[PDB]
Design a protein around this nucleic acid. Structure first.
Lengths: 124, 111, 101, 175
RNA sequence: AUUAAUAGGGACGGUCGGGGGCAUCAGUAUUCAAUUGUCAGAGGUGAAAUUCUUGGAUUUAUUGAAGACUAACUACUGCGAAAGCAUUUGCCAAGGACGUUUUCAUUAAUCAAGAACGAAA
């Protein structure tokens, strides 16, 4: 159904400040479309990279790197939060394997050195 | 009927039987007759037979004073103790009823 | 020394975890009879300092309380008290408050 | 007037309904009002003005709780007599988790019910284990050993210490 | 652009938990103090002893102050990384199961070394 217009809907939706799952959830809710794998022939993140709407960090990682720094605020409210620090040791292992993917698969350089110190600068 | 009544606190615990029937208010108990006073061996304090002998004095002091009825606030140990009603209950409360004292709206009010 | 509005703010880019600059800045802001820039400073140094520094963080609640001791209010020193009682320990700010009182 | 109420699990109320008509048949002999609240799953021992003494309602209130603690209503029937008083021990506040609480649960029972029947032959009481209670009924000088066995065995103490003191006191009895 | 492991992260929304951190309010039970009525015993024991006791031991009732816990309902019930976990309600952050033609495409599996929680004293 004029296949490039779903990309032109995505070209404003990636310009609308949202993740690639947010373009896929919204278009499948109010526009009838199935997925980015549908007949239009382009991935959701790759079409955002093809027109200059892609982010700086990986969307798999940047919602996990933000979740690592935000969950430390409750641990900054209580150092006796023995499970939130246990969640902080686990969630910082979730973003670290994500950045190690982009370092090998050439989405990020091998000198990035993701740290929870500067993760508040990469969450905002 | 005229309701000549007070309140009856019977301590039917596991080690002794102490009877102190109070007034309509909690203070000024007109009678206080122990179970270990009507039997002198130090072992019959929890016996209901000594509590039944004690219950004749318990009906006596209120009938001397003017309380013809008594509502039973029965007492076991309760709380951080064995919490169950002992032996001194079924005879001491019955002998007040056997003495014609009117029972009504009775209770177990221990911990 | 840092004695201007631009002076102590520039040191915050060089020293983020230092509440001692904001401890002198709150002495430099409220000295000009406007402690609203001093109450802003103790609020700013909470969100500017590192969360791993507990010596300046508990002192930041001790700074805004001791400023509240002479130049504060009745329920403003207590609303900052129960905020420190959730972000930090209860009686250690109260044993600080017992020495403050 | 008087009323003492006890709540019951699903296991005994159907066993009650074959005997609660006999409980009201038996409570009427002392003029006590017994309620079969199948909506509430609870029974209340209430007093009447046609009764002799209010103390038999509390003795039936121990029988009603014995009827609600999965003990037999024939075994709860002797509580209305004089020289038989019950002991409905709650042993809930011993261990929070179910692991170590079930470790001492079978140790207070024993293999094939021998050790649970051992205190029945040691302290002369009807020991009834159902759920989270240990109910006994008998003479108070024997029932004093019942609460001493029930309160300590839910802790780290075994019944082998309780039975060995009981086997020594029973052997020196005849003299 | 070979497929989107009925592998995995990440995202939405309906749920739920005695999960934990903080807070809320509710509940019985205990001690001590102020104090009235009254005592020959009270406690303890197989029988005793011991202990306090016309210094009122002891019972009842009332008030104050302080510390603990959520019996019956309530259990082979769920949850917590494990340890552990029960009043009403919240804040913050964590989590079992869920469905997407939602997003990435192995980011994935075991862990020496080495570190975090943490059952008793």
């Amino acid at each position: 159904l004029s296949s490039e217009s779903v990309i032109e809907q995505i070209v404003k939706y990636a310009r609308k400040g949202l993740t690639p799952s947010q373009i896929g959830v919204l278009l499948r809710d109010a526009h009838g479309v199935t997925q980015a794998r549908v007949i239009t022939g382009n991935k959701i993140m790759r079409i955002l990279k093809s027109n200059g709407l892609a982010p700086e960090i990986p969307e798999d990682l940047y919602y996990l790197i933000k979740k690592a720094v935000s969950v430390r605020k409750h641990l900054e409210r209580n150092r006796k939060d023995k499970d939130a620090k246990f969640r902080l040791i686990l969630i910082e292992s979730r973003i670290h394997r994500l950045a190690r993917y982009y370092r090998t698969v050439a989405v990020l350089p091998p000198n990035w050195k993701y740290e929870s110190a500067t993760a508040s600068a990469l969450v905002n | 009927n005229s309701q000549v009544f007070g309140v009856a606190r019977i301590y039917a615990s596991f080690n002794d039987t102490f009877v102190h029937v109070t007034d309509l208010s909690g203070k000024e108990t007109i009678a206080r007759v122990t179970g270990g006073m009507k039997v002198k061996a130090d072992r019959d304090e929890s016996s209901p037979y000594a509590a039944m002998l004690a219950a004749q004095d318990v009906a006596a002091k209120c009938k001397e004073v003017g309380i013809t009825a008594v509502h039973v606030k029965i007492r076991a140990t309760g709380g951080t103790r064995t919490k169950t009603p002992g032996p001194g209950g079924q005879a001491a409360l019955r002998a007040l009823a056997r003495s014609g004292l009117r029972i009504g709206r009775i209770e177990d009010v221990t911990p | 020394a840092p004695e201007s509005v631009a002076d102590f703010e520039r040191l915050l880019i060089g020293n983020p975890n230092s509440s001692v600059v904001w401890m002198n800045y709150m002495a430099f802001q409220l000295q000009l009879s406007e402690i609203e820039k001093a109450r802003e400073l103790a609020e700013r140094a909470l969100k500017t300092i590192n969360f791993r520094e507990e010596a300046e963080k508990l002192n930041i609640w001790i700074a805004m309380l001791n400023l509240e001791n002479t130049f504060g209010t009745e329920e403003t020193l207590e609303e900052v008290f129960s905020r420190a009682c959730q972000y930090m320990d209860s009686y250690t700010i109260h044993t600080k408050l017992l020495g403050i009182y | 007037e008087s009323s003492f109420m006890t709540l019951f699990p699903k296991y005994r109320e159907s066993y009650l309904k074959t005997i609660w008509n006999d409980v009201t048949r038996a409570l009427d002999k002392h003029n006590i009002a017994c309620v079969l609240d199948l909506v509430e799953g609870s029974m209340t021992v209430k007093t009447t003005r046609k009764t002799y003494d209010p103390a038999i309602i509390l003795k039936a209130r121990d029988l009603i709780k014995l009827l609600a603690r999965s003990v037999p209503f024939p075994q709860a029937v002797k509580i209305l007599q004089d020289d038989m008083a019950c002991d409905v021990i709650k042993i809930g506040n011993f261990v929070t988790n179910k692991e170590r609480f079930v470790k001492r649960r079978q140790r207070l029972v024993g293999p094939n019910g021998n050790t649970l029947k051992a205190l029945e032959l040691l302290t002369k009481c009807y020991i009834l284990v159902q759920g989270n209670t240990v109910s006994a009924m008998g003479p108070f000088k024997g029932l004093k050993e019942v609460r001493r066995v029930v309160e300590d065995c839910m802790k780290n103490i075994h019944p082998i210490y309780h039975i060995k003191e009981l086997m020594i006191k029973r052997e020196l009895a005849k003299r």
